[PDB]
């Protein structure tokens, strides 16, 4: 806020995104017959590889069992793409 002779003046600090790039996406991922969904953000792909990032910034990350949750089956949802979901426990076990 800022004082004015007969009023008040604000300085609204706003977050305006820019520099947008368009990518091919799917609403879910089928891995071993289980439909995967993102805990937050949406799935993206730079042509071939798939990634997970938030809806307000491009921060791609490897699809992991920890950032996604599984529900339903691979048949009930349309638009799913066939892809593999990384599991962090397997390398530790091996």
């Amino acid at each position: 806020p800022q004082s004015a002779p007969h009023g008040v003046v604000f300085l609204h600090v706003t977050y305006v995104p820019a520099q947008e790039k368009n990518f091919t996406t799917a609403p879910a991922i089928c891995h071993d017959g289980k439909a995967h969904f993102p805990r937050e953000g949406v799935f993206v792909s730079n042509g071939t590889h798939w990634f997970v990032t938030q809806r307000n910034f491009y921060e791609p990350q490897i699809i992991t069992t920890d950032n996604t949750f599984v529900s339903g089956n691979c048949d009930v949802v349309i638009g799913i793409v066939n892809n593999t979901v990384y599991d962090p426990l397997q390398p530790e076990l091996d």
Binding site: T14, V16, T25, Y58
Partner: peptide, 14 residues
């Protein structure tokens, strides 16, 4: 088709 920003601009509005 998804368009996601890769940058942001902070602007003050009066």
């Amino acid at each position: 088709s998804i368009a996601i920003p890769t940058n942001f601009t902070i602007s003050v509005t009066t």
